[PDB]
Amino acid sequence: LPVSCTVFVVEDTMEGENGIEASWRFVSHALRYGAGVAVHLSKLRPKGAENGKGLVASGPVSFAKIYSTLNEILRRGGVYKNGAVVCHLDLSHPDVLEFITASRSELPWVKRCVNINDHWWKEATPTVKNALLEGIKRGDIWLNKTKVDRNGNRIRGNVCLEVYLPSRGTCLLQHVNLGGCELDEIRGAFAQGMSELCELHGKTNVGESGEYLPSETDRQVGLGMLGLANLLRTQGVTYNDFGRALEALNSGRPYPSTPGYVIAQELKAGIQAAAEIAKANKMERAFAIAPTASCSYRYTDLDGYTTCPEIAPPIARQVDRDSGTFGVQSFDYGPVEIASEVGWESYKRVVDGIIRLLDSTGLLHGYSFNSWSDVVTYDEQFIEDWLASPQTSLYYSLQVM
Amino acid sequence: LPVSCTVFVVEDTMEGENGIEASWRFVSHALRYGAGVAVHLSKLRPKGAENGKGLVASGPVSFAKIYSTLNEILRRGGVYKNGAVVCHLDLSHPDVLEFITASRSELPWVKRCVNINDHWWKEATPTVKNALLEGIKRGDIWLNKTKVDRNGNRIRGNVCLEVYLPSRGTCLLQHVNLGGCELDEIRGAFAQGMSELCELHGKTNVGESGEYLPSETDRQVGLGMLGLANLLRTQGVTYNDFGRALEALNSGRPYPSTPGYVIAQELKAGIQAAAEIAKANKMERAFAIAPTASCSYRYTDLDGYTTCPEIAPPIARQVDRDSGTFGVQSFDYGPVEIASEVGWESYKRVVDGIIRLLDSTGLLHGYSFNSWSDVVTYDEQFIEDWLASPQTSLYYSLQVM
Ligand SMILES: Cc1cn([C@H]2C[C@H](O)[C@@H](COP(=O)(O)OP(=O)(O)OP(=O)(O)O)O2)c(=O)[nH]c1=O
Ligand SMILES: Cc1cn([C@H]2C[C@H](O)[C@@H](COP(=O)(O)OP(=O)(O)OP(=O)(O)O)O2)c(=O)[nH]c1=O
């Protein structure tokens, strides 16, 4: 199916409609088509908890092994080999420590994400914090925040962390190419994208298979953006200037009409237009920023160069992608600013400003924030700053220098 | 349930009534109650077989890992911890070699049995034979023969190898205590046991759960025997004399009326009476010899000593059984002959004679033959002799001296 991702929550019982065995069947079905899953194990009771009629429960870390085996077998046998599994878990779970410290031999083919917020982080003991920092520094444990819908009932993130869905949901995404649109066309492009997304929401028919929710009950769609670096290059605006202009616009402070200010105002106007169009069709959540590693390569800017993925600056001007089918393809991002030159502060400020702009309308799913391992030093201060900032995830740990 | 064992055969398809996923659910259900399973993987296509719509199949050895994980988790969490899994496989399967050589790290918590006969053994290449001999010498691979019902449709052995059942079947067993019955009472005891088994066959209601076959369609029961060594001791008959008498009786040759001959004639008469009673109730198969390690300890002979398990001679006169609940219990088998003193030949001849007597009526399931590793040298000649002899399995590799 076109469904890129799906979300499943497993109840604390072996059998049922959403039982662990039903979880095995659903994961097998999702992997046989290539779509990834995010099996949330936050409800399984802790390991060693005795009920009285002796059933010494094993805990989520035990079933992680079953999911790992299923993933390995089916992905190596599956038609689509791009599927992945992400076994989310909470930070308040008493088992989290074990979940953090399991070596790659025990759980070889499953990524791991931790749902954290202010309360659980504060309550966590120092040992758990140190284990989390060590894990993230080695690139094993991802982070994600917790957000409740307007009714207060919990919603859960997907595989790639920027879309928030309920149980057995699905994800519909569409990307707007900033590099390929002129400054005046931004609002029109945003309106066209949002209208197309609203129209396409009701014609997917994903839920007909009986595994997914019906389309009428979802009321969600994600309008992401890609190709910011090319736009900044074309207008001759550096990341520092764009970040300062975005911060000034968001704070409401007066600012001179520099090109960065014009771009920021155009982005705000387009976001507002898209928000109005979505509100017309009764869309709960509209804006979601997802990585475009597999989608950016098929688009081009005005000058003919390849558009940079999402809004971050490309690590290197030229990228050589190796695929077993089409071989090795060497593409160029043009004379754009790259990670080492811009610096950590400019990138962080720019992403924070854009995420604040998108969130201002209240229709934000999330963002798949990266992290440059060769520049910043992982510390509890870094996690505190990440939690304080409007970001909503921590995806990968790259090397830039 | 009282069901000691069950048999499942998995088809070559992911979904269905007997699909691999149905196999996972059935194995989980069987393990949650302690009853073991014998998941026959002889129908899964070989690893690496391509169909054209790319599905590079993994093979049975891959799903052995899923079954191992399920067994580990559920047995350590299961209420009854006596459950076990035995992943049968054929000798003609092109994957058998891998199945034989997998180390204990890959498949830690699943036993392995090989279904062999004359044709497959002859067709097997030397490397497979050497791998099988090495495996059996280390006590990893068990053997079992192939037998077809009166209609020619294949039937499959259970976990402990002496009962032959169809898919989703069950096993009903009852044991006759030779040590606790006088020489004249043998026929009456056999008749009583067979009548009780026939009566109890139709009142188990195992198939009401929807997983097992209905009781009306089974038409099977197993009348085993235990406590031969005590009987031989009481009558003052050594294993050699009893074996010679049994061989003479079976061959039809004239023989003097020695005590061994009297015992053999009584056994034959009792077997014939039980066979007639079973045939009265239309029983397809009636006689099955199973190990009594967990059942012999609750019975006593005429002199008050504990009866020896099945028909083999006990390894040591005194046995100290350690259980976490009742602690350590030291029981005595009395002044009975033991393994080293009797020798391999006498034991082999006695078991062969008794199995021939039981098979003479055509109502034999099988026998769980042991093997003394410290006496016999494993060679292709040994396997040839085992195949030639009326035995039907090869269970464990013990040490006697
Ligand atoms: C039976 C069993 C349960 N468990 C644990 C893990 C599951 O999350 C949890 C679900 O057990 P349940 O299936 O709900 O056990 P139960 O219904 O018989 O008893 P109760 O209602 O009190 O739970 O039990 C094991 O880990 N291993 C086992 O073998
Ligand atoms: C899809 C898939 C199949 N297989 C192998 C193992 C199973 O024994 C076997 C069953 O596949 P099927 O489910 O029968 O595949 P199919 O129905 O789409 O195509 P066909 O009818 O030709 O089989 O395929 C894998 O090993 N891994 C996989 O991911």
CSV table of C-alpha atoms in Angstrom, one decimal, chain A:
chain,number,residue,atom,x,y,z
A,1,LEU,CA,0.0,0.0,0.0
A,2,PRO,CA,1.0,3.7,-0.3
A,3,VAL,CA,0.8,3.7,3.6
A,4,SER,CA,4.4,4.6,4.6
A,5,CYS,CA,3.9,4.0,8.3
A,6,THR,CA,1.4,2.5,10.8
A,7,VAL,CA,1.0,2.5,14.6
A,8,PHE,CA,-0.1,-0.4,16.8
A,9,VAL,CA,-0.6,-0.5,20.6
A,10,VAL,CA,-0.6,-3.9,22.3
A,11,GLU,CA,-2.8,-4.6,25.3
A,12,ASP,CA,-1.7,-6.5,28.5
A,13,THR,CA,-3.3,-9.8,27.5
A,14,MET,CA,-2.3,-12.7,25.3
A,15,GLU,CA,-5.6,-12.8,23.3
A,16,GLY,CA,-8.1,-10.3,22.0
A,17,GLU,CA,-8.6,-7.9,19.1
A,18,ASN,CA,-5.3,-6.1,20.0
A,19,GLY,CA,-3.6,-8.9,21.9
A,20,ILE,CA,0.0,-9.8,21.7
A,21,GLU,CA,-0.8,-12.7,19.3
A,22,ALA,CA,-2.8,-10.2,17.3
A,23,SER,CA,0.3,-8.0,17.5
A,24,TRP,CA,2.4,-10.8,15.9
A,25,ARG,CA,-0.1,-11.2,13.1
A,26,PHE,CA,-0.4,-7.5,12.4
A,27,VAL,CA,3.4,-7.0,12.4
A,28,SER,CA,3.8,-9.9,10.0
A,29,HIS,CA,1.2,-8.5,7.7
A,30,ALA,CA,2.7,-5.0,7.8
A,31,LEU,CA,6.2,-6.3,7.1
A,32,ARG,CA,5.1,-8.5,4.2
A,33,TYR,CA,4.2,-5.2,2.4
A,34,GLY,CA,7.2,-3.2,3.5
A,35,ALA,CA,5.3,-0.7,5.6
A,36,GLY,CA,7.0,-0.2,9.0
A,37,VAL,CA,5.4,-0.4,12.4
A,38,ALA,CA,5.8,1.2,15.8
A,39,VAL,CA,4.8,-1.4,18.3
A,40,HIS,CA,4.2,0.5,21.6
A,41,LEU,CA,5.0,-1.8,24.6
A,42,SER,CA,4.2,0.7,27.3
A,43,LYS,CA,1.2,-1.4,28.7
A,44,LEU,CA,2.9,-4.7,29.4
A,45,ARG,CA,3.4,-5.3,33.1
A,46,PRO,CA,6.9,-5.3,34.5
A,47,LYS,CA,9.1,-8.4,34.5
A,48,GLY,CA,8.8,-10.5,37.6
A,49,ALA,CA,5.4,-9.2,38.7
A,50,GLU,CA,3.5,-12.1,40.4
A,51,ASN,CA,-0.3,-12.2,40.4
A,52,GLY,CA,-0.9,-15.1,42.8
A,53,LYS,CA,-1.8,-17.8,40.2
A,54,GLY,CA,1.8,-18.1,39.3
A,55,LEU,CA,2.5,-16.2,36.1
A,56,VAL,CA,5.9,-14.6,36.3
A,57,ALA,CA,5.5,-12.1,33.5
A,58,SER,CA,8.5,-11.6,31.2
A,59,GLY,CA,8.0,-7.9,30.3
A,60,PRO,CA,8.3,-5.9,27.0
A,61,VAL,CA,12.0,-6.7,26.6
A,62,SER,CA,11.2,-10.3,26.1
A,63,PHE,CA,8.7,-9.8,23.3
A,64,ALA,CA,11.1,-7.4,21.7
A,65,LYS,CA,13.0,-10.6,20.8
A,66,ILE,CA,9.9,-12.1,19.1
A,67,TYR,CA,9.4,-8.9,17.1
A,68,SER,CA,13.1,-8.8,16.2
A,69,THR,CA,13.0,-12.4,14.9
A,70,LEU,CA,9.9,-11.6,12.9
A,71,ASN,CA,11.4,-8.5,11.4
A,72,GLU,CA,14.6,-10.3,10.4
A,73,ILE,CA,12.9,-13.2,8.7
A,74,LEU,CA,10.2,-11.2,6.9
A,75,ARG,CA,12.4,-8.2,5.9
A,76,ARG,CA,15.0,-10.6,4.4
A,77,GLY,CA,12.1,-12.5,2.7
A,78,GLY,CA,9.8,-9.5,2.2
A,79,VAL,CA,9.1,-8.1,-1.3
A,80,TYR,CA,9.7,-4.5,0.1
A,81,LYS,CA,12.8,-4.4,2.2
A,82,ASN,CA,12.5,-0.8,3.4
A,83,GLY,CA,10.3,-1.8,6.4
A,84,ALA,CA,11.5,-1.2,9.9
A,85,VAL,CA,10.3,-1.7,13.5
A,86,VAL,CA,10.6,0.8,16.3
A,87,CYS,CA,9.7,-0.6,19.7
A,88,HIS,CA,8.7,2.5,21.7
A,89,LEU,CA,8.7,2.5,25.5
A,90,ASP,CA,8.1,5.0,28.3
A,91,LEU,CA,10.6,6.5,30.7
A,92,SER,CA,8.5,5.8,33.8
A,93,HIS,CA,8.4,2.1,33.0
A,94,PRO,CA,10.4,0.3,35.7
A,95,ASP,CA,12.0,-1.9,33.0
A,96,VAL,CA,13.3,1.1,31.0
A,97,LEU,CA,16.8,0.6,32.3
A,98,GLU,CA,17.1,-2.9,30.9
A,99,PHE,CA,15.5,-1.7,27.7
A,100,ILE,CA,18.2,0.9,27.4
A,101,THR,CA,21.2,-1.3,28.1
A,102,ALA,CA,20.3,-4.3,26.0
A,103,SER,CA,23.2,-5.0,23.6
A,104,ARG,CA,22.9,-5.2,19.8
A,105,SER,CA,23.2,-9.0,20.1
A,106,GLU,CA,19.9,-9.4,22.0
A,107,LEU,CA,17.8,-7.1,19.8
A,108,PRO,CA,19.7,-6.9,16.5
A,109,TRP,CA,17.0,-5.7,14.0
A,110,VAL,CA,14.8,-3.3,16.0
A,111,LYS,CA,15.4,0.4,16.6
A,112,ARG,CA,14.4,1.8,20.0
A,113,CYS,CA,12.7,5.0,21.0
A,114,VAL,CA,12.0,6.5,24.5
A,115,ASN,CA,8.9,8.6,25.2
A,116,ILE,CA,10.0,11.3,27.6
A,117,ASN,CA,8.7,14.6,29.0
A,118,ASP,CA,9.3,16.9,31.9
A,119,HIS,CA,7.7,14.8,34.7
A,120,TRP,CA,9.3,11.4,33.8
A,121,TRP,CA,12.7,13.1,33.2
A,122,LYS,CA,12.6,14.8,36.5
A,123,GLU,CA,11.5,11.6,38.4
A,124,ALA,CA,14.2,9.5,36.7
A,125,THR,CA,17.1,8.4,38.8
A,126,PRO,CA,20.7,9.4,37.9
A,127,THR,CA,21.5,5.9,36.7
A,128,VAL,CA,18.7,5.9,34.1
A,129,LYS,CA,19.8,9.3,32.9
A,130,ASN,CA,23.4,8.2,32.5
A,131,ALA,CA,22.3,5.0,30.6
A,132,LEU,CA,20.1,7.1,28.3
A,133,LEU,CA,23.0,9.5,27.6
A,134,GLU,CA,25.4,6.7,26.9
A,135,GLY,CA,22.8,5.0,24.6
A,136,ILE,CA,22.1,8.2,22.6
A,137,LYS,CA,25.8,9.0,22.3
A,138,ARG,CA,26.3,5.6,20.7
A,139,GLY,CA,23.3,6.1,18.4
A,140,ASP,CA,21.0,3.3,19.8
A,141,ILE,CA,18.2,5.2,21.6
A,142,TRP,CA,16.0,7.8,20.0
A,143,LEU,CA,13.8,10.2,22.0
A,144,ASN,CA,10.2,11.5,21.5
A,145,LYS,CA,7.8,13.7,23.4
A,146,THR,CA,4.3,13.0,24.5
A,147,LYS,CA,1.3,15.0,23.2
A,148,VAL,CA,-2.5,14.5,23.9
A,149,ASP,CA,-5.2,15.3,21.4
A,150,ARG,CA,-7.8,18.0,22.1
A,151,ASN,CA,-9.9,15.4,24.1
A,152,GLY,CA,-6.8,14.5,26.2
A,153,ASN,CA,-6.7,10.9,25.0
A,154,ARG,CA,-3.1,9.8,24.2
A,155,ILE,CA,-1.9,9.7,20.7
A,156,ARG,CA,1.3,7.8,19.6
A,157,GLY,CA,4.1,8.6,17.2
A,158,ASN,CA,4.9,6.7,14.0
A,159,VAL,CA,8.1,5.0,12.9
A,160,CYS,CA,9.9,8.1,11.7
A,161,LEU,CA,8.7,10.2,14.7
A,162,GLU,CA,7.1,13.3,13.0
A,163,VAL,CA,3.5,12.0,12.6
A,164,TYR,CA,1.3,11.4,15.6
A,165,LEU,CA,-1.4,8.8,15.1
A,166,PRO,CA,-3.9,6.7,17.1
A,167,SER,CA,-3.9,2.9,17.3
A,168,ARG,CA,-4.0,1.1,13.9
A,169,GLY,CA,-3.8,4.4,12.2
A,170,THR,CA,-1.9,5.4,9.0
A,171,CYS,CA,0.0,8.4,7.7
A,172,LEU,CA,-0.6,10.6,4.6
A,173,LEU,CA,2.1,13.0,3.8
A,174,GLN,CA,2.8,15.5,1.0
A,175,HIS,CA,5.9,17.8,0.6
A,176,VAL,CA,6.1,21.4,-0.7
A,177,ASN,CA,9.3,22.2,-2.6
A,178,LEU,CA,10.5,25.6,-1.5
A,179,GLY,CA,13.5,25.6,-3.9
A,180,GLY,CA,11.2,25.1,-6.9
A,181,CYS,CA,8.8,27.9,-6.0
A,182,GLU,CA,9.3,31.7,-6.3
A,183,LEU,CA,8.9,34.0,-3.4
A,184,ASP,CA,5.5,35.2,-4.5
A,185,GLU,CA,4.3,31.6,-5.3
A,186,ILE,CA,4.8,30.3,-1.7
A,187,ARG,CA,1.3,31.0,-0.6
A,188,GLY,CA,-0.3,29.6,-3.7
A,189,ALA,CA,1.9,26.5,-3.5
A,190,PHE,CA,1.0,25.9,0.1
A,191,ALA,CA,-2.7,26.4,-0.7
A,192,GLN,CA,-2.6,24.0,-3.6
A,193,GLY,CA,-0.7,21.4,-1.5
A,194,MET,CA,-3.2,21.6,1.4
A,195,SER,CA,-6.2,21.4,-0.9
A,196,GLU,CA,-4.7,18.3,-2.7
A,197,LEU,CA,-4.0,16.7,0.7
A,198,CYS,CA,-7.5,17.3,1.9
A,199,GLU,CA,-9.0,15.9,-1.3
A,200,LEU,CA,-6.7,12.8,-1.2
A,201,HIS,CA,-7.4,12.1,2.5
A,202,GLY,CA,-10.8,10.6,1.8
A,203,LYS,CA,-9.9,8.3,-1.2
A,204,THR,CA,-7.1,6.1,0.1
A,205,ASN,CA,-9.4,3.3,1.4
A,206,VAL,CA,-6.7,2.0,3.6
A,207,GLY,CA,-9.1,0.6,6.2
A,208,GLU,CA,-10.9,-1.7,3.8
A,209,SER,CA,-8.4,-4.5,4.6
A,210,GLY,CA,-9.8,-4.7,8.1
A,211,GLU,CA,-6.5,-4.1,9.9
A,212,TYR,CA,-6.6,-0.2,9.8
A,213,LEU,CA,-9.0,2.4,11.0
A,214,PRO,CA,-11.7,3.7,8.7
A,215,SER,CA,-10.8,6.8,6.7
A,216,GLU,CA,-13.7,8.8,8.1
A,217,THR,CA,-12.4,8.5,11.7
A,218,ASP,CA,-8.8,9.6,11.1
A,219,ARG,CA,-9.0,13.3,10.3
A,220,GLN,CA,-5.3,13.8,9.9
A,221,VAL,CA,-2.8,14.7,7.1
A,222,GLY,CA,0.8,16.0,7.0
A,223,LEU,CA,1.9,18.9,4.8
A,224,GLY,CA,5.7,19.0,5.1
A,225,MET,CA,8.3,21.1,3.3
A,226,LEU,CA,11.7,20.5,1.7
A,227,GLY,CA,14.3,22.5,-0.1
A,228,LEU,CA,15.0,25.4,2.1
A,229,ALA,CA,18.7,25.6,1.5
A,230,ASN,CA,18.3,26.1,-2.2
A,231,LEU,CA,15.8,28.9,-1.7
A,232,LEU,CA,18.2,30.6,0.8
A,233,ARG,CA,21.0,30.3,-1.8
A,234,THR,CA,18.9,31.7,-4.6
A,235,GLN,CA,18.0,34.8,-2.6
A,236,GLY,CA,21.5,35.2,-1.3
A,237,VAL,CA,20.5,34.8,2.4
A,238,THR,CA,22.8,33.0,4.8
A,239,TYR,CA,21.5,30.7,7.5
A,240,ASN,CA,22.4,33.2,10.2
A,241,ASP,CA,20.5,36.1,8.6
A,242,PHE,CA,17.4,33.9,7.9
A,243,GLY,CA,17.5,32.6,11.5
A,244,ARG,CA,17.7,36.1,13.0
A,245,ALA,CA,14.9,37.3,10.7
A,246,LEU,CA,12.7,34.3,11.7
A,247,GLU,CA,13.3,34.9,15.4
A,248,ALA,CA,12.5,38.6,15.0
A,249,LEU,CA,9.3,37.8,13.1
A,250,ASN,CA,8.2,35.2,15.7
A,251,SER,CA,8.9,37.4,18.7
A,252,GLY,CA,6.9,40.3,17.1
A,253,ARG,CA,9.8,42.7,17.5
A,254,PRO,CA,10.2,45.4,14.8
A,255,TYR,CA,12.8,44.6,12.1
A,256,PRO,CA,13.9,46.2,8.9
A,257,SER,CA,12.6,44.8,5.6
A,258,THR,CA,15.7,42.6,4.8
A,259,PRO,CA,15.3,39.7,2.4
A,260,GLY,CA,15.2,37.3,5.3
A,261,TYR,CA,12.3,39.2,6.7
A,262,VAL,CA,10.5,39.0,3.4
A,263,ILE,CA,11.0,35.3,3.2
A,264,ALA,CA,9.8,34.8,6.8
A,265,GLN,CA,6.7,36.9,6.1
A,266,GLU,CA,5.9,34.9,3.0
A,267,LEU,CA,6.3,31.6,4.9
A,268,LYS,CA,4.0,32.9,7.6
A,269,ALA,CA,1.4,33.9,5.1
A,270,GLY,CA,1.5,30.6,3.3
A,271,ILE,CA,1.3,28.7,6.6
A,272,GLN,CA,-1.8,30.8,7.6
A,273,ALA,CA,-3.4,30.2,4.2
A,274,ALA,CA,-2.9,26.4,4.5
A,275,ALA,CA,-4.2,26.4,8.1
A,276,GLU,CA,-7.3,28.2,7.0
A,277,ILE,CA,-7.9,25.8,4.1
A,278,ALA,CA,-7.4,22.8,6.4
A,279,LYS,CA,-9.7,24.2,9.0
A,280,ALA,CA,-12.3,24.5,6.3
A,281,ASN,CA,-12.3,20.7,5.8
A,282,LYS,CA,-12.1,20.0,9.6
A,283,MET,CA,-8.6,18.7,9.8
A,284,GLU,CA,-7.4,17.9,13.3
A,285,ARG,CA,-3.7,18.1,12.5
A,286,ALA,CA,-2.2,19.4,9.2
A,287,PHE,CA,1.6,20.2,9.3
A,288,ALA,CA,4.2,17.5,9.7
A,289,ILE,CA,7.9,17.7,8.8
A,290,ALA,CA,9.5,14.4,7.8
A,291,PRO,CA,12.9,13.5,6.4
A,292,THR,CA,13.1,13.5,2.6
A,293,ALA,CA,16.1,11.2,2.1
A,294,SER,CA,14.2,8.9,-0.2
A,295,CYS,CA,12.0,11.6,-1.8
A,296,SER,CA,14.2,14.7,-2.3
A,297,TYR,CA,16.2,13.1,-5.1
A,298,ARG,CA,13.3,13.2,-7.5
A,299,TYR,CA,12.8,17.0,-7.4
A,300,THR,CA,14.9,19.9,-8.8
A,301,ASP,CA,15.1,23.6,-8.0
A,302,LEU,CA,14.8,26.6,-10.4
A,303,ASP,CA,18.4,26.5,-11.4
A,304,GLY,CA,18.3,22.7,-12.2
A,305,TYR,CA,20.2,21.5,-9.1
A,306,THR,CA,18.8,18.9,-6.7
A,307,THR,CA,16.8,20.3,-3.7
A,308,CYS,CA,18.3,19.8,-0.3
A,309,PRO,CA,16.4,17.4,2.0
A,310,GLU,CA,13.9,18.9,4.5
A,311,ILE,CA,15.1,22.2,5.9
A,312,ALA,CA,18.6,21.3,7.3
A,313,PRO,CA,21.7,22.2,5.4
A,314,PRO,CA,23.2,19.3,3.4
A,315,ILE,CA,26.3,17.6,4.9
A,316,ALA,CA,28.2,17.7,1.6
A,317,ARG,CA,27.5,19.5,-1.7
A,318,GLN,CA,27.8,16.3,-3.7
A,319,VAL,CA,26.0,13.1,-2.6
A,320,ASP,CA,26.7,9.7,-4.1
A,321,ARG,CA,23.8,7.3,-3.5
A,322,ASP,CA,24.4,3.6,-4.0
A,323,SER,CA,21.5,1.3,-4.9
A,324,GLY,CA,21.6,-2.3,-6.0
A,325,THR,CA,19.2,-1.7,-8.8
A,326,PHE,CA,20.2,1.6,-10.4
A,327,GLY,CA,23.8,1.5,-9.2
A,328,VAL,CA,25.6,4.6,-8.0
A,329,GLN,CA,24.2,8.0,-8.8
A,330,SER,CA,26.1,11.2,-8.1
A,331,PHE,CA,24.0,14.3,-7.6
A,332,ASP,CA,24.9,17.8,-6.6
A,333,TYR,CA,23.2,20.2,-4.2
A,334,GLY,CA,24.8,23.3,-5.8
A,335,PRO,CA,26.8,26.0,-4.0
A,336,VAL,CA,24.8,25.8,-0.8
A,337,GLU,CA,25.9,26.2,2.7
A,338,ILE,CA,26.8,23.0,4.5
A,339,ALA,CA,26.8,21.7,8.1
A,340,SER,CA,30.3,22.6,9.3
A,341,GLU,CA,30.3,26.1,7.8
A,342,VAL,CA,27.0,27.2,9.2
A,343,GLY,CA,27.6,25.9,12.7
A,344,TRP,CA,25.3,24.4,15.3
A,345,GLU,CA,23.7,27.6,16.6
A,346,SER,CA,22.4,28.8,13.2
A,347,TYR,CA,20.8,25.5,12.3
A,348,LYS,CA,19.2,25.1,15.7
A,349,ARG,CA,17.8,28.7,15.6
A,350,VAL,CA,16.4,28.2,12.1
A,351,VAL,CA,14.7,24.9,12.9
A,352,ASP,CA,13.3,26.3,16.1
A,353,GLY,CA,11.9,29.4,14.3
A,354,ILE,CA,10.3,27.3,11.5
A,355,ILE,CA,8.8,24.9,14.0
A,356,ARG,CA,7.4,27.7,16.1
A,357,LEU,CA,5.8,29.2,13.0
A,358,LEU,CA,4.2,25.9,12.1
A,359,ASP,CA,3.0,25.4,15.7
A,360,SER,CA,1.5,28.9,15.9
A,361,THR,CA,-1.6,27.6,14.1
A,362,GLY,CA,-1.9,24.5,16.5
A,363,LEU,CA,-1.8,22.0,13.7
A,364,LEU,CA,1.7,20.5,14.2
A,365,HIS,CA,2.5,16.8,14.4
A,366,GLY,CA,6.2,17.0,15.0
A,367,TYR,CA,9.7,17.2,13.5
A,368,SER,CA,12.5,14.6,13.1
A,369,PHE,CA,15.3,16.6,14.6
A,370,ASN,CA,18.9,15.4,13.8
A,371,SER,CA,22.0,15.9,15.9
A,372,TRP,CA,25.6,16.5,14.9
A,373,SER,CA,27.7,14.2,17.1
A,374,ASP,CA,31.0,15.8,16.2
A,375,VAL,CA,30.1,19.3,17.4
A,376,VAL,CA,27.9,19.1,20.5
A,377,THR,CA,28.8,17.3,23.7
A,378,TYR,CA,25.9,15.1,25.0
A,379,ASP,CA,25.0,16.2,28.6
A,380,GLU,CA,22.0,16.5,30.8
A,381,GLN,CA,22.2,20.2,29.8
A,382,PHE,CA,21.8,19.2,26.2
A,383,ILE,CA,18.7,17.1,27.0
A,384,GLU,CA,17.3,20.0,29.1
A,385,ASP,CA,17.7,22.4,26.2
A,386,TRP,CA,16.1,19.9,23.8
A,387,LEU,CA,13.1,19.5,26.1
A,388,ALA,CA,12.8,23.2,26.6
A,389,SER,CA,12.9,23.9,22.8
A,390,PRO,CA,9.8,23.4,20.8
A,391,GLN,CA,11.4,20.3,19.1
A,392,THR,CA,9.6,17.0,19.4
A,393,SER,CA,12.1,14.2,18.7
A,394,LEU,CA,15.8,13.2,18.3
A,395,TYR,CA,16.3,10.9,15.3
A,396,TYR,CA,19.9,10.3,14.3
A,397,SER,CA,23.5,11.1,15.4
A,398,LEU,CA,25.5,12.1,12.3
A,399,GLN,CA,29.1,13.3,11.8
A,400,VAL,CA,29.7,16.5,9.9
A,401,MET,CA,33.3,17.6,10.2
